[PDB]
Enzyme design. Structure first.
Site, mmCIF file in Angstrom:
data_model
loop_
_atom_site.group_PDB
_atom_site.id
_atom_site.type_symbol
_atom_site.label_atom_id
_atom_site.label_comp_id
_atom_site.label_asym_id
_atom_site.label_seq_id
_atom_site.Cartn_x
_atom_site.Cartn_y
_atom_site.Cartn_z
ATOM 1 N N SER A 42 0.543 -1.373 0.240
ATOM 2 C CA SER A 42 -0.152 -0.151 -0.180
ATOM 3 C C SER A 42 0.805 1.197 -0.088
ATOM 4 O O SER A 42 0.526 2.193 -0.470
ATOM 5 C CB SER A 42 -1.577 0.639 1.487
ATOM 6 N N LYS A 45 0.607 3.228 -2.699
ATOM 7 C CA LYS A 45 -0.537 4.261 -3.124
ATOM 8 C C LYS A 45 -0.349 5.621 -3.445
ATOM 9 O O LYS A 45 -0.820 6.364 -4.107
ATOM 10 C CB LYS A 45 -1.889 3.982 -2.624
ATOM 11 N N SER A 90 -7.157 3.252 2.962
ATOM 12 C CA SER A 90 -6.106 2.736 1.855
ATOM 13 C C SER A 90 -6.512 1.917 1.137
ATOM 14 O O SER A 90 -7.282 -0.014 0.767
ATOM 15 C CB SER A 90 -4.854 1.804 2.906
ATOM 16 N N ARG A 222 3.986 0.553 13.882
ATOM 17 C CA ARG A 222 4.560 0.723 12.535
ATOM 18 C C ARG A 222 4.695 2.127 13.132
ATOM 19 O O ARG A 222 5.674 2.868 12.967
ATOM 20 C CB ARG A 222 3.426 0.264 10.889
HETATM 21 C C1 LIG Z 1 -1.931 -2.070 1.741
HETATM 22 O O1 LIG Z 1 -0.779 -2.155 2.444
HETATM 23 N N1 LIG Z 1 -2.403 -2.772 2.058
HETATM 24 C C2 LIG Z 1 -4.409 -2.363 1.749
HETATM 25 C C3 LIG Z 1 -4.918 -2.062 3.334
HETATM 26 N N2 LIG Z 1 -4.106 -1.063 4.149
HETATM 27 O O2 LIG Z 1 -3.122 -1.846 4.562
HETATM 28 S S1 LIG Z 1 -2.465 -0.572 5.958
HETATM 29 O O3 LIG Z 1 -3.326 -0.666 6.820
HETATM 30 O O4 LIG Z 1 -1.302 -0.321 5.587
HETATM 31 O O5 LIG Z 1 -2.695 1.037 4.792
HETATM 32 C C4 LIG Z 1 -4.638 -3.779 3.917
HETATM 33 C C5 LIG Z 1 -3.512 -4.087 3.769
HETATM 34 C C6 LIG Z 1 -2.866 -4.047 2.163
HETATM 35 C C7 LIG Z 1 -3.464 -5.606 1.291
HETATM 36 N N3 LIG Z 1 -3.816 -6.896 2.246
HETATM 37 O O6 LIG Z 1 -3.591 -5.094 -0.086
#
Ligand SMILES: *C(=O)N1C[C@H](NOS(=O)(=O)O)CC[C@H]1C(N)=O
Ligand SMILES: *C(=O)N1C[C@H](NOS(=O)(=O)O)CC[C@H]1C(N)=O
EC number: 3.5.2.6
Lengths: 237, 235
Positions: A42, A45, A90, A222
């Site tokens: 992510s 993004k 996200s 994190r």
């Molecule tokens: C990005 O890594 N993703 C989308 C979503 N949010 O993750 S975040 O909390 O780090 O922003 C879920 C995890 C991940 C995915 N599974 O695609």
């Protein structure tokens, strides 16, 4: 120069990378992991958003992408989004659509111009940042953000300013954080990311960290472990 | 649709002061205030003038960007934070008058006047001991144009000033705003104007309040947030 500082190992396993913009020096707890490339997940993004806006796949931060109606794991996903919220929560399905419409040729062209990590998109056009061949380390992340920070990526200024607005995470009278979380799930070794920067009255400190993430449990760490590093280093109170 | 809500006066009463907050629900195009009359009374903008002033200085190129450094003239003033170098971001945060005075002199009277007329801002160092007057309802009208990038300045100039107005952000809301304190002419009042961005909506606000001494300054924000909480806008 770079100092290795193993005391932050205490707050952890993973790595924290800082760059002092004014002084033009770095800090980490593991020189070697700081240079270990992983799947961006992510944190992809950021450059996805940059590319989507420059090409006009996304008009602006207000455009509504409507929920397709199908209910997915994360509940914040199952509504309408714009760029600000898609990035806050996200929202993968929004960014998949972006990836499809960008296309594979424009995507790699853009990634080569951004000098982004290993520059390689093999896998699906709508999931390569999760389970294709893309790889970036913490210092490569900082290096990308430094450029984003200064408007020197090869996309419009406007596109650069909108993504940094959408990166907004926290602000008060002490500091402003613009950043993005990530969680690499499909491929070993599982890892959680946070990268971005903290703005101060008269400096900016760039940051990239990841850590091992065998479970969904530790995601809060994190932010919390990065923030513990920022205090010990007296960058924030 | 405006609605007068007298209950908010207890947040003023609670500190032995008086004043107005005005709220505007952007989605529903509805306004709310505790005092309809004061909502529409015009006061000197004071430091809230740093908003249009910033916009104008950027659009004209008097300020090149948010990193251009405006060095201290070396004269020590009594806000301690003014006695240092500043960019647009910090000068706005610490409300640095002599930097903005430099901006205005370089903009000049002709260009200022015609830009404020194009903004439809206020009536027809003037923002502090002189001529321009604006109401809390008009601040909101001006802020809404800014929010939507509808002012007669570049989109760019509007995005830089909105970045510069950033005051607070967390997982619940983002506030972009500007404080003011009118001290030269009676009645001494404090201001806070700006907006709150939520996931689903934005709420614009403009408040002013009697401010005989600098001791109540904190109340500008606190009473405003007491009103935001009462209305379930922030937790
Ligand atoms: C990005 O890594 N993703 C989308 C979503 N949010 O993750 S975040 O909390 O780090 O922003 C879920 C995890 C991940 C995915 N599974 O695609
Ligand atoms: C603006 O109203 N001012 C500049 C400075 N900032 O005060 S603020 O926190 O209210 O914005 C001091 C007071 C005032 C002024 N006297 O010019």
């Amino acid at each position: 120069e770079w100092q290795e500082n193993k005391s932050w190992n205490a707050h952890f396993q993973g790595v924290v990378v800082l760059w002092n913009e004014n002084k033009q020096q770095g800090f980490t707890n593991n020189l070697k992991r700081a240079n270990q490339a992983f799947l961006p997940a992510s944190t992809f993004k950021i450059p996805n958003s940059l590319i989507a806006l420059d090409l006009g796949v996304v008009k602006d931060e207000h455009q509504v992408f409507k929920w397709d109606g199908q209910t997915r794991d994360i509940a914040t996903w199952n509504r309408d989004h714009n760029l600000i919220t898609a990035m806050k929560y996200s929202v993968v399905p929004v960014y998949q659509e972006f990836a499809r419409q960008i296309g594979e040729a424009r995507m790699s062209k853009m990634l080569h111009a951004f000098d982004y990590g290993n520059e390689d998109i093999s896998g699906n056009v709508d999931s390569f940042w999760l389970d294709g061949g893309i790889r970036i380390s913490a210092t490569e992340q900082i290096s990308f953000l430094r450029k984003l920070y200064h408007n020197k990526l090869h996309v419009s200024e406007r596109s650069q300013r909108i993504v940094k607005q959408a990166m907004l995470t926290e602000a008060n009278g002490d500091y402003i954080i613009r950043a993005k979380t990530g969680y690499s799930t499909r491929i070993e070794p599982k890892i959680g990311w946070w990268v971005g920067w903290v703005e101060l009255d008269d400096n900016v400190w760039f940051f990239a960290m990841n850590m091992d993430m065998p479970t969904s449990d530790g995601l809060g760490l994190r932010q919390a472990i990065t923030k513990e590093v920022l205090k010990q280093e007296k960058i924030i109170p």
